[PDB]
């Protein structure tokens, strides 16, 4: 099916404590493959998936060099936004950045994204046309103007449409045995009685990959549903519950790893 | 593969 490569960056100033914290994480689909923590000892970009450990010292030095440069730029960003918003040198602030590309089943470019947040609020985002920006406020418009004057969208689009897709296809190939695998959910039902006149039913979806799943109670939708959560082994979990004595009158599971959607009853 | 160009806000 469709795949994606995304990079998530967090920069947090610490005026008293020290230099800003910088965390960078790289994902292919729902699998993390690289990390950088400015507070870790290595000061290197680190592998987090077995298939990326195949890459040579040139990849790693280059990925290190780049992540350190992203770090330096975001340090400057922090001081720029403090300037833009007339903030004191004494408070902590957070800049988050996200960028990446989506491919289809054909492995052809589909969607590109490159956006920023400041203190938890949108700030700037590249539009779907990969040609124009969305500034969230009048401070964010100062960025837009300098990025329009400097032709940033065009260089960014060259990375999102070309470079990004090329490396995503490489990652998808080099790690085909993990990235290109559908783990079907191990579903089951649990019964617990809340009262002597009421009962609770829990539909479980376990050990599935990718994270996209739909659990529905047959359609009834007014039920307790939990956020899809990692199991920690590269697989995910989720459960859907519903609140008598006639608890035999069903839960529907739809996942990418299921040929025909499975239906559960007690 | 990180983007080699960085842009100042």
């Amino acid at each position: 099916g469709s795949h994606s490569m995304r990079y998530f960056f967090t920069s947090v100033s610490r005026p008293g404590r020290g230099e800003p914290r910088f965390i960078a994480v790289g994902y292919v689909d729902d699998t993390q493959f690289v990390r950088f923590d400015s507070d870790a000892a290595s000061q290197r970009m680190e592998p987090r998936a077995p298939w990326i450990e195949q890459e040579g010292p040139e990849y790693w030095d280059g990925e290190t060099r780049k992540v350190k440069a992203h770090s330096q730029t975001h340090r400057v960003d922090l001081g720029t936004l403090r300037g833009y918003y007339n903030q004191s040198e004494a408070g902590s602030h957070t800049v988050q950045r996200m960028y990446g590309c989506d491919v289809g089943s054909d492995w052809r470019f589909l969607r590109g994204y490159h956006q920023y947040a400041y203190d938890g609020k949108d700030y700037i985002a590249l539009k779907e046309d990969l040609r124009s920006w969305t500034a969230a406020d009048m401070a964010a418009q100062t960025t837009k103007h300098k990025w329009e004057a400097a032709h940033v969208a065009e260089q960014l689009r060259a990375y999102l449409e070309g470079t990004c897709v090329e490396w995503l296809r490489r990652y998808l190939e080099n790690g085909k045995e993990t990235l290109q695998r559908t783990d079907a959910p191990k579903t089951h039902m649990t019964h617990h009685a809340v009262s002597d006149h009421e009962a609770t039913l829990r539909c479980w979806a376990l050990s599935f990959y990718p994270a996209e799943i739909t659990l529905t109670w047959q359609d009834q939708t007014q039920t307790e549903l939990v956020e899809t959560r990692p199991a920690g082994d590269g697989t995910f979990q989720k459960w859907a519950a519903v609140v008598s004595g006639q608890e035999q009158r069903t839960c529907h599971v739809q996942h990418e790893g299921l040929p025909k959607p499975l239906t559960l009853r007690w | 593969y990180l983007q080699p160009r960085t842009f100042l806000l």
Partner: T-cell receptor
Amino acid sequence: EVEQNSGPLSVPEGAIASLNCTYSDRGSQSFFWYRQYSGKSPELIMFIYSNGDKEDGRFTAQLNKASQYVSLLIRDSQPSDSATYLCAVNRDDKIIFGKGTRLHILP
Amino acid sequence: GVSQNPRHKITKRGQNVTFRCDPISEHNRLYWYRQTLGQGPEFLTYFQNEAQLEKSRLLSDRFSAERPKGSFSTLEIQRTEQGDSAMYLCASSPDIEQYFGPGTRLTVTE
């Protein structure tokens, strides 16, 4: 970064002058053509950031990211064009220049 | 917009030189380049504000650049060799496109 330009080019006044250039890093995003007169410093004549052709008057720049190639074509060559042409390509957030091609516009 | 001083400089082999660069005002990125006849500008160093981020691996310990307040920059060659003879170009940039200065033509004489 290796950026490859070439040797002396003599083209008559009014003819088409064509400069070629290749860069070693497929990851590059920013491509320029700098012109440099004798005893002067480089000035930007064109930038190209997408595959395709960019036309600016008598100048046509071409970029091929898949074959890591950049050209510059000058239509109706004039004496003012006799300069060394420097192909410039980014290596992260710095421009790395080629050796330069000296172009002579002959009367 | 970019200024350089001195425009021409003659020094005796073994002396020390300092060239100054006054970049364009809103330009956060500053570069130093080296050029000889029939060659292109050779990358020496790069500043993003006051920080010197990248420095040429091939560049000697005799060459050291500074940009104190993230504005003007100085490049200094200590105990000059005759191979140091070249034009020293400074360039400023807001993003990637470079605006070169009028250079410093350095001649190192025996």
